[PDB]
Structure formats: C-alpha cells, structure tokens
Amino acid sequence: EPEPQMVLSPLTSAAIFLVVTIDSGGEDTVRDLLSDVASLERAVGFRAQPDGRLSCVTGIGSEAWDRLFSGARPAGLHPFRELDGPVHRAVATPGDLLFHIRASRLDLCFALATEIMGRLRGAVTPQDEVHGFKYFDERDMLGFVDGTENPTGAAARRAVLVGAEDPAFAGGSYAVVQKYLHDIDAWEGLSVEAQERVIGRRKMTDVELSDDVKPADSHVALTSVTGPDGSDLEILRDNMPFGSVGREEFGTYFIGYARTPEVTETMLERMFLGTASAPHDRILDFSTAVTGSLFFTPAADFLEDL
Template sequence: MPEPAPPPAATGGPAPAPPPQPQDVLTPLTGAAVFLVLTIDPGGERTVRDLLPDLAGLRRSVGFRAPDGGLACVAGIGSDAWDRLFAGPRPAGLHPFRELVGPRHRAPATPGDLLFHIRAARMDLCFELAGLLTGRLAGAATVVDSAEGFRYFDNRDLLGFVDGTENPEGRAAAAAVTVGAEDPAFAGCSYVIVQKYLHDLDAWNALTVEQQELAVGRTKLTDVELPDAVKPPDSHVALTGVTGPDGEELQIMRFNMPFGSFAGGGEFGTYFIGYAATPAVTEEMLRNMFLGRRPGRHDRLLDFSTAVTGSLFHVPTADFLDDPPPAPPVPPETGAAEVAEAAPAPTESPATATASDGSLAIGSLKRTPAR
C-alpha cells in the first residue's frame, strides 16, 4: 500500500496583498467626454467623502444601461482639498498648480479641488453620470469649470492636427502614468494636469498650411513629425519632448478632446488633460512651452492661444476611493455647535469626524470679430 503524500510545506506567512487597483486612466480614446472641475464649499467635506466610495456604483448604474458604451470615470483630488478630506500622509508629488509667467505668455493657476473625467462612446452616458455626481454634491461643491468633449474626425483638434500621436502604448503607457516604488504608500496612483486655452482661430487660419506645420512640428494631413533639420526649435513638438538624465524619453498620456459653443460669437477648443506618474514631466513640458528652453523661444502655438485655466490633481487608486482613510481631526478653533453638526454617527470613531468649516495639442479656439 503506497504511503500517503506528505502535506504541503508551509508558506511561511500570509499570502501577499494584491496590488492596488488603479482607476480607469488607461481606457481607450472615446467619442465623448465631460470634464468637471469643482471646488469644495466650506462644510462640504463630509458630503464629498461620502460620495467617494459610491463612485464605482454610480458608474455601474449608468453604464449597465448601455454595456457597449465603455463608460469610465476618473476622479482626482487637488492639493488643498487633500488636507481637508484625509488625515495621514500626502502623495509626494501633490501640490497646487504652479503658475508660469513668461516674457509674452502666461499659464495661470485656477481653483480646483475635485476633477471628474468622464468618458464614453456616447455623450448621453457622460451627461447622465455628470448629473448624478453634481446632484450628490449640490450644496457641498461648486462646478468652476466644465467642458463637453467630442471626437473630431480622425482624432484631430480644432486646429486641424491629429492630437495624441505620441501617447505611449502597452507597458510603456502603464509605466508613464503609474506611481511606483518611489512613493510606496501611493503605488498605483497617478497625477493629472488639466488646462483650457482660447485660440485666435482667425489668425491661425490666416497662416498657410506650411506655416502651421512649422508651428506644430508635424505635417497636417499625414501627421508625420518633421525632420530635425526642418522642425523649428520653437515648434510645439520640439518643446514638449522631455528626456531623463540618461537620455530616455519621458512620456505622459493625453486624452485631449475638442469642445465648442456657438453662443456669444463662438468659442471652440480642445481640453488638455495629461496623466503622468509624476507631475514633474508635464510641468517641464509647460515650462518649455511658456518660458522656452532658451530666452525668447516659447512655443509658437502660444502666439495663437491664451491659457485660461490650470489645475493639478492626484488620482488615487480605486481601492483608496472605495475605502478612504480617516478624515482629519476637527480644528481646535471650531465652535461647539459646528462640531456637533460635523460629528459622525455614534457607531463611528470620533477620529473620523470631519470639520464643517472646512495639446499637448493645446487649446480652445475663439473666433475674433470680423473686421
């Protein structure tokens, strides 16, 4: 009779924890998008915290009604809002958007506590989810910027050039947008910068195609990068290329989309949204554009555009949103009545109480009046 097999050897400890689950940053380009930037009203922190674990369920409730719609939503949190919402450590790269003032052009910093980047094949799905989110936040947060994006022919911006050609793919895309061992407490997270530009469309269209191509650094029809011998050093492509200390190319993921309105003489544009594992890469691109690698060599596209917004957000993992860390303690100066209003239910720990006082094809295109 054969002897029974020996029991399996002990593993020596508990199974390793599964890796953090990122949000849906790397979903494919879609035909529609809604971009929402909000500021948190004083006392609105609890409502915002209550919404975060429900984001995935709200997306599913809308997306289930159109399974082929590819509905996705990425949430980002600004630097000032982070300390109002969460106790504990901060992401290493999180800070307010840094204004850039060059000799001729300026990239302003504008308010932004929350970002919702909603994408789908159809606008009705984006619109429905945006309505649910803003409805839940009514009285707690204020929408300070919004845009409804759409696909324009073969992924072109309204300047007529293909947008996002240099996006990395596959593993390179994940490496470009995902925080790793450099900030282990926030591994799997990302950073995102959003901007909106107003362009002088009449002045742009007055250029010849060749002049436009020299400003962008690519051919307009075929989307081929110009040779280095032809590409001007102040072209958009030349200035937005960033390399690391060993000469490696540093990349971001752009999900820019055109938007527009015909009211008030017309305002049309592209909403820039760039994801990266560190905001430093996108920030260097912007410094090159607005300040130039050499004095007076700013991005030539900026001669036809004016930056009007700029915000930086941390993109936590989906696991973080499902189970956020505790809220910060109530500040000592908070009044007793306000503490009572902000106090959690009796079943919760007092430590979780929330204070109640609490592009690059750039651009937006703006028509100038006829002269």
Template sequence: MTVEPATGPEPQSVLSPLTTAAIFLVATVDEGGEQSVRDLLADLPGLQRSYGFGAPDGRLSCVAAVGSDAWGRLFGGPRPAELHPFEELAGRRHRAVSTPGDLLFHIRATRQDLCFGLAAEIMDRLRGSVTVADEVQGFKYLDVRDLMGFVDGTENPQGRAAVDAVLVAGEDADFAGGSYVIVQKYLHDLDAWNALPVEAQEKVIGRTKLTNVELDEPASHVSLNTVTDEDGEERQILRDNMPFGSPGRGEFGTYFIGYSRTPEVTEEMLRNMFLGTPDATHDRILDFSTAVTGTLFFAPSADFLDDLPEPPAAAAAERPVPHTRTESPEGTGADGTLGIGDLNRSTAP
C-alpha cells in the first residue's frame, strides 16, 4: 500500500510498492535540449496516466529525477540543499565509480509492456535533446531474489517509517516531498559466486539463503549496510533493486536504486562497503559484484513538476538589478558631464 505524507507537497510515486518489472533510464541533457526536457517533465504525469488508464492493475508509475550538473540548467531559483555529484570511492580492492547522468526515469509496473510503452514515449519526446547513458530492464526473479540467489529488500521501511526515511521535510522546505536517489549498476561473476559453498555465501551476505534469516556476521553485507545515528537508531533508505541480465551475453546483474531523505545515509553505506570499517576491509560481495555506474539525483515532488520554476535565464531576468553610483574626480563623470543621474548598472550573477 502506498503511503503519502500527512501534510505538505505530494511526492512522486517514490513510495509505490515493489513491482515485477521496471525500466531504468539514465540520460544526459544535450546542449540546447533544456526546454524539451522541461516540457517533458511537465507532461510526465499526464503521460503516465494515459498509458496506465487501460490497465489499472498494471500499477504503472514513473519517478523522474534530476542530477546536480543539470539542475541549474533546467531551473532557476534555489536548488536542493544536498544535491551534488556522486562521489567516487576508491578502496584498496574495489571502486565505486561516478558516471554521467542528468536525468533518471524510474519506470515501474506489473507488466513490462507498460514500462516499455512509457519509456518509448519519453524517448520519442526527448529524441535529439538527450543522450542515453544507460538503460536497464529489470524483472522480478523467483520469490523476490537477486541473481545471486538471496532475497533482496527485506529491510525496507514501511508506513510512516518509510515517509520519514525517504521524503525531505522542513529541513529544506522549498523541496519538501522530494527524495534523493542513488543508482548503481552491478555486474556479477556468477561462476565464481556459485563455486562458493552455500554456507560461505551466507557469511558474505549475512542471511541464510533458503529462509532469509539474518545472521550475526559483523563483516557481512547486511552488517555493513546497517548504519545508525548518534542515539543508536538505525538510519534507513528505501531500496527498489531489480535483477537484470542477458544469458546470451553472459551478463548478470543487480540494479541498485536507493531513495532517502538525505544522500548521506546511502553514502555512508557505500563508504562502509568500499572503504571498509574496523570489522572489515571491504564488503566481500564486491569480490563477486562490480559497480559499473554510479550517479546521484534528486526526485522533486509531484507538485514541483506540476508547476516548474522559471528557467534560469527567465529567473535571472526577474531579479532586481543592483544600482551603484559611479563617483568621478571633482564631481565629473567619465564622459566629462557632472554625472547627475549617471548610474553604473551591473547585472546580478
């Protein structure tokens, strides 16, 4: 069941339940393509309704998010307080790469054809205005397992806890109802992974493979992704990871996508994984899974998309222009006049 915040701007469908199909589209905005992107973002809720109307049981939804480099190109005025480029992490053995991405479209449904149709419409609208950096079609695998054979997403917050963990509130009032989202595409070496005994796999993950029971393993993937605040309370994110792959190409992976009220929670988890902790030099799952992308975005509220801020040029034109009087020696202006009413106008940055 989708949970909406009690008050404040309406979020996008960030809190929608997990689905059986998804498409993740990451794109960069071409020079001169800003207006086409703005037009698409404004029309996106209507496109989603149109494609989903004939299949209400399909639960079609789409979350649009914008990266740090593109925000100032698309919108004038303030920007989300914690929006910044994804920070690359270079550990002793493994690296979390930072890759380009101005736009993220996270399209979900119970049917892949609905995801496909909406993705095709989005790209038709943006053709010539953006360059696709990555496209992944995700699917539900067995009983919500990843391709390594373990249940994924067990610890997602529910209800009010999900709202508190995921949606920006009064700490950044201009962007209340929005959410930060980090995506990473991981490729798995399944031959090496499946060569491990099940018991060894369970120690790496920190859960039993068959029954999904958490184990007491301080250096496990589960432990390294459990972070707490100064009071010992767990800080949570909302994961909507999906398996993807191509057996013909020998490609098997997990698309990680984590929504959070502040990106620092997900970033701390990633630091634990790649840089290590006192209990572990690194997350041992990285010995079998390689991150090939990494990007940070902000998904603004649905109200924000419904009433986009002015573009940067228009917003700048509306700002008051400061006026400073030019003083010249002996009361004369640079052109030899008395300088009465002579103003030196400079445009605000």
C-alpha cells in the first residue's frame, strides 16, 4: 500500500500557498529539499501536537518534472490549459513547485514555509504567496458556506488518489490552483435571493436549491458532472479566503484535488466556456482568475526515495 501525502487532511483554519519556479542550476537543491520535506513537516509540527494539524503537500509541475526526473511521467501531467471563454478567461501562469501548507495556526504554516524557502534560497524564484484564513463558519469571501459537498472517507480516496490506472504513481493526485479576486461592491449589490441563484444554495442554512428552482448557470449546476455510468464525478476542494483591506483585495484561493485532471478540467470548461444551457458560471461575473497552474502531488514514498 503506497503512502499518500496529506491530501485528505481534516479541516484547518489557516493555510500558506507557495508557488515557485526553479531557476536554472537549481535542480539539485530542489531535489535535496524534496527528500527532506516530510521530516521538516514533522520537525515543525510535532512541537505543537495534536491540535496543530500541520501538513504540507508538495506538487510538481509538468515542465519541471522533465528537468527533475527521468523515466516515467504521470499519465495526466501536462501544463495548465488556458481557457479563452467568450466573456471570461482562465489564465495559465508559471509554476514549477506547489507547497500547500495547512494548520490550525498560521504560525505553524509560516515556520514550515520559512524552513522550506530557507533551503531553496538561490534555486527558486517565488511566483505567488498567499496566507489563507478560515472565515467564520466555513464561509468564503462571498459569505457562503464553502466545502459542504466535499467527499469524505472512501468516496474521497476513490475521487482523489491515483490507483491501478497508473500503478507507478499510485497514491499520487493532481492539484489545480487558481487565485480569484472578487468584486465585492457588485456582489453586495445583489439581493440575498439573487446571490442564492448565483451559487445554487441558500445563504444562511446552506440548503441546496431544489432542481426546479436552481438555475442552469448557477455554480452548483455547472460544477455537477455525472460520469459514464451515472456516478457523480467528484473533486476535493480546500478554498481559502485571503485579502488586504487597504488594497481592496478580497479573494478565494481555489485548490482542487482529483485522481485525474480531466475531471477538474471538465468543470473549468463548463464554467468558462459554457454549455448549451448556460453562457457561463455566474460566479465568474463576480470573480476573476489571476493565476492558474496544474501540479502532480506524488505519493510520500516517492519523495523519500530520491
């Protein structure tokens, strides 16, 4: 049984997202860190167990994988596909490595980030750094409960982890990241009932709208994908609010894990390109993607044996 990384972690209150590119000649330094990352996570985390719940998930990009490793590639590993929709665009931005650091405390995240980046000084260039925070009762920046319909247990494992379809990379996963900025002024201009029609759920109670009320262009409608056998195709999401009040930045940092990127990409396509029934996802009228990257997060045992 291959040990996965802490993809299927419990709910945490704080996150740091770290996206870097690998400078030329930096390959060796990166490789050294990769084999040490698990022990660094344990070194920082153990001090404050068991309420710390510190984890780090390391992701490697498509272009970077070719620079770092020879031999087999994960079947689904490719650069993020840019989506030029009629109205909305899903941009692809550079990213070689992803560090998805989560804890119940921000300091634990920052300490681990410090350690990781300290080792990576002069080998990487930082592309993006986001410090996320749980907002109230699991609500996002739009004021809706965010995470409700995430799969749990065996359903989560089946949706997230690579299996026998790519046996060399079993216990791995695929992560899609996008940084979204919200137009809060426009959003708070809508009535609650109008916002509900945008999301597809009720605001306070988080009850899903009935199928006869739920618009075809609501976020919930478009991100609902049925598979070839009638089964729901699921992803695991850990959206984190971030922001700066002075610069008027109110954002959602989207991260979605799946066993194949094709599930996540189908959702993206429906959202940005639209379908026959829906011009595009209404949430995009209040949200702008400013980054977009795809990573493969290998099994933990892959990282150690380098």
